[PDB]
C-alpha cells in the first residue's frame, strides 16, 4: 500500500515467478492469481566497507605565521616549527645592510613558517561491488487504515540484499514467505573506479586520475595532521629580496566540480548513496498465501469514512469502516456497470478483509473507463457509489 501516491509506479503481473526492476524513486506493485498484492520499494543503498584511498584538501587556511632572519655570514635561520609537520616552511635570501640592521652588506637568510589547516576536503573511497547493501521494503496490500503511502514501514518488511547475497526469503506476517533473487544493474562497475565524495555530492572517477590530482593529501592510513604536498596550495613570495610572505592558492571546490563534468554523478547522503543504477530482481509467490480466504462474507453494512480519491494511474482508493458484526470478516467488493449486468473493474487490493470493526479498510481498485458503480458490502445498506473515469 506504500506505492499508492507515487508517480513512478510500475504494475507487474505474474503468470501463476516474476521479474521486477527496483530503483530510487521507483515503486513496484506485484499481482498474482490467488496471491496477495505486494508493494516493493528500494529505500536505501549503502557502500558498507569503503576503503578511503586518499583525502584531498580543496580549501586550505594558513595560520600561526612565524618568521626568523639572520644577518649575512651568521648562518641559516631556524624555527622549531620546521620540525612540526602541521607547518609549512621555506628558506630564502633577503638584502641586508646597515640601514636594515646588519654590520655587513649581503644576502641574509630568512625563514617563514605557517600552520596548514584544512577547511574543506574531498574523500576518495574504493567500494567493493559485492559490499553494496540494498534495503527493500515489501509492503503487502493489507487494507490496514494507516498502510496507504505510510513511509514508516511499520507495515512492510525491511530486507537487505547485496550483489552476491542475491537470494533471500522474506517472511510477511499473515501472508507467508516471498523468495527474492536479485542482480545489480549498475551504470558503471566499481572496477578501477573511485567514489569521489565531496560534501553532499559524489562521483565515480578513474583511479589513476584521482591519484594524479595536484592537491594536498592524507593517505587512507592517516585519516591525521601531516598533509602531504602542502606546496600545491601554498606559495611563498619574495620578489624584491626584502620580505618573504606566505600565500594560500584559494578554494579548489568549484574548480573540481568543473573537472567532474565528464564524470558519472551520484546523489550522496552521509555514507548512503541514491544510486542511479537499477536492481533486477526475480521473485516467487509459491510460498505466499492470502490472509484469511477461509473467512465468510460481511453480513453487515459499511460506512465510507474518506472521499474516494483517484491515483495518478487512474486507480481509485476507498476507505470504508464496518458497522456490522462478524469481524474478522471478508469485505464483499464489486465494480459493475450502471445496469449491474457485468463486473468490470480489476481489484488491486486483492481479498479485502475486516480485522477489527473500529479499524477502517483501504481498498484500491482499477475502475473501468467511463461510468461505473462501486459496490461495497451486501444488501441491505449496500454502498452504491457512482464513478467517472475519462
Amino acid at each position, epitope marked *: 500500500m506504500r506505492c499508492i501516491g507515487i508517480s513512478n509506479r510500475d504494475f507487474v503481473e505474474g503468470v501463476s515467478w516474476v521479474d521486477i526492476v527496483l530503483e530510487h524513486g521507483s515503486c513496484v506493485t506485484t499481482m498474482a492469481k490467488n496471491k496477495p498484492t505486494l508493494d516493493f520499494e528500494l529505500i536505501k543503498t549503502e557502500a558498507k566497507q569503503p576503503a578511503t584511498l586518499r583525502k584531498y584538501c580543496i580549501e586550505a587556511k594558513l595560520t600561526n605565521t612565524t*618568521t*626568523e632572519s*639572520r644577518c649575512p655570514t651568521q648562518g641559516e635561520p631556524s624555527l622549531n616549527e620546521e620540525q612540526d609537520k602541521r607547518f609549512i616552511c621555506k628558506h630564502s635570501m633577503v638584502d641586508r645592510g646597515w*640601514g636594515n*640592521g646588519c654590520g655587513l652588506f649581503g644576502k641574509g637568510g630568512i625563514v617563514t613558517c605557517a600552520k596548514f589547516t584544512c577547511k574543506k576536503n574531498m574523500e576518495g573511497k574504493i567500494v567493493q561491488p559485492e559490499n553494496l547493501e540494498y534495503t527493500i521494503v515489501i509492503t503487502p496490500h493489507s487494507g490496514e487504515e494507516h498502510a496507504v503511502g505510510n513511509d514508516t514501514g511499520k507495515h512492510g518488511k525491511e530486507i537487505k540484499i547485496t550483489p552476491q547475497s542475491s537470494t533471500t526469503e522474506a517472511e510477511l506476517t499473515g501472508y507467508g514467505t516471498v523468495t527474492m533473487e536479485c542482480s545489480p544493474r549498475t551504470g558503471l562497475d566499481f572496477n578501477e573506479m573511485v567514489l569521489l565524495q565531496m560534501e553532499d555530492k559524489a562521483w565515480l572517477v578513474h583511479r589513476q586520475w584521482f591519484l594524479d590530482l595536484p592537491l594536498p593529501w592524507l593517505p587512507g592510513a592517516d585519516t591525521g595532521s601531516n598533509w602531504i604536498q602542502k606546496e600545491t596550495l601554498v606559495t611563498f613570495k619574495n620578489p624584491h629580496a626584502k*620580505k618573504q610572505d606566505v600565500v594560500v592558492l584559494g578554494s579548489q571546490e568549484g574548480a573540481m566540480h568543473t573537472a567532474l563534468t565528464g564524470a558519472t554523478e551520484i546523489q550522496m547522503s552521509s555514507g548512503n548513496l541514491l544510486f542511479t543504477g537499477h536492481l533486477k530482481c526475480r521473485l516467487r509467490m509459491d510460498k505466499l498465501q492470502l490472509k484469511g480466504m477461509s473467512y465468510s462474507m460481511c453480513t453487515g453494512k459499511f460506512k465510507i469514512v474518506k472521499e474516494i480519491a483517484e491515483t495518478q494511474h487512474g486507480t481509485i482508493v476507498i476507505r470504508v469502516q464496518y458497522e456490522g458484526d462478524g469481524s474478522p470478516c471478508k469485505i464483499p467488493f464489486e465494480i459493475t456497470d450502471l445496469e449491474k449486468r457485468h463486473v468490470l473493474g480489476r481489484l488491486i487490493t486483492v481479498n479485502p478483509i475486516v480485522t477489527e470493526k473500529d479499524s477502517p479498510v483501504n481498498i484500491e481498485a482499477e475502475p473501468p473507463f467511463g461510468d461505473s458503480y462501486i459496490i461495497v458490502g451486501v444488501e441491505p445498506g449496500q454502498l452504491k457509489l457512482n464513478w467517472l473515469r475519462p
Partner: antibody, heavy 132, light 111 residues
Framework: VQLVESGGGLVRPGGSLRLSCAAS????????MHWVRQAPGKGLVWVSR????????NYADFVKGRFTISRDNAENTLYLEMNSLTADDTAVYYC??????????????????????????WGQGTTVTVSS | QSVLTQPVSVSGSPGQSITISCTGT?????????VSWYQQRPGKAPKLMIY???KRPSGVSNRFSASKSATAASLTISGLQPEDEADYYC??????????FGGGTKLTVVG
C-alpha cells in the same frame, strides 16, 4: 613622545578583554612594540612583541596562545586581545616602544635572533583585575 | 629557555657605590651582552637605564654604569642618592624570539 593605554578594568574568570594603546611623537610604523605587565606590588613580566609589518608576533610561555597582539600603523595603535583570563593575569599592562632597535633596523621588520633592543618609552599602564 | 635572578634587596648609604647583579640559568655570554636595566620608583612607570649590557641612554644620570661578564650582568650606582631608592629590574632574551625580566631588586638608601 607618548604612549597611552586603554581598555583595562574588571573582568570575570574565563572572560575576554581588548587593551588599546595610542602612540604619538615618533615614526610608529618603523618601531617594534611590546606589552609588559606587573601584578600589584610585584615584578615586571614580559608579555608580547610585534614588528613593523605584524609578520612577527612573539609571546611569553604563560600566554599559551590566549592573547593576540596586533597593530594599526596608520592609526598609530597597538592592541592586545586577551581571552581565557585567570587570577594570575591580574596586573597593570604597559605599552612599550623598542626605541633602540630602530637605530639598527630603521624598517622595524627583520626578526633577527637576539637582536639589540631597549624598551625606552613606556605608557602609564592600564589596570586589569580578573575576579570571580 | 633562560631565567634571570637578582638579589631581593640592596642597602646602601648616601654617597656610597652599590652594585646589583643579574645572573642566569640556561644563559650564555649573549644573554649578558643583551641585558637591559630598568628603574621603577614607587607607583611610577619603569625607566630604561642601560641597554646592550653597558650602554647608558642620554638623559640617564652619569652615576649609573653597568658591566657584564660571560656569567652575569651588573648595574652600578656610584654616589648613591635618596632619589635612587626604587626597584631595579634586569631584562634579556629567554629564547631567540622572547624576552624575560629578573625578579627585581629593592634598593634602600639607608636613612
Amino acid at each position: 613622545v607618548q604612549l597611552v593605554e586603554s581598555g583595562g578594568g574588571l573582568v570575570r574568570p574565563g572572560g575576554s578583554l581588548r587593551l588599546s594603546c595610542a602612540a604619538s611623537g615618533f615614526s610608529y610604523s618603523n618601531h617594534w612594540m611590546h606589552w609588559v605587565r606587573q601584578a600589584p606590588g610585584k615584578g615586571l613580566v614580559w608579555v608580547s612583541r610585534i614588528n613593523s609589518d605584524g609578520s612577527t608576533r612573539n609571546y611569553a610561555d604563560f600566554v599559551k596562545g590566549r592573547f593576540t597582539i596586533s597593530r594599526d600603523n596608520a592609526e598609530n595603535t597597538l592592541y592586545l586581545e586577551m581571552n581565557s583570563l585567570t587570577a594570575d593575569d591580574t596586573a597593570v599592562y604597559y605599552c612599550v616602544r623598542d626605541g633602540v632597535r630602530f637605530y639598527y633596523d630603521s624598517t622595524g621588520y627583520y626578526p633577527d635572533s637576539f637582536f639589540k633592543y631597549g624598551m625606552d618609552v613606556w605608557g602609564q599602564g592600564t589596570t586589569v583585575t580578573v575576579s570571580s | 629557555q633562560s631565567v634571570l635572578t637578582q638579589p631581593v634587596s640592596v642597602s646602601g648609604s648616601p654617597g656610597q657605590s652599590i652594585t646589583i647583579s643579574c645572573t642566569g640559568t640556561s644563559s650564555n655570554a649573549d644573554t649578558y651582552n643583551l641585558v637591559s636595566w630598568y628603574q621603577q620608583r614607587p607607583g611610577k612607570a619603569p625607566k630604561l637605564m642601560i641597554y646592550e649590557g653597558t650602554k647608558r641612554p642620554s638623559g640617564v644620570s652619569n652615576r649609573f654604569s653597568a658591566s657584564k661578564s660571560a656569567t652575569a650582568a651588573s648595574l652600578t650606582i656610584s654616589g648613591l642618592q635618596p632619589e635612587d631608592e626604587a626597584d631595579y629590574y634586569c631584562c634579556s632574551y629567554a629564547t631567540s624570539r622572547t624576552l624575560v625580566f629578573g625578579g627585581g631588586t629593592k634598593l634602600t638608601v639607608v636613612g
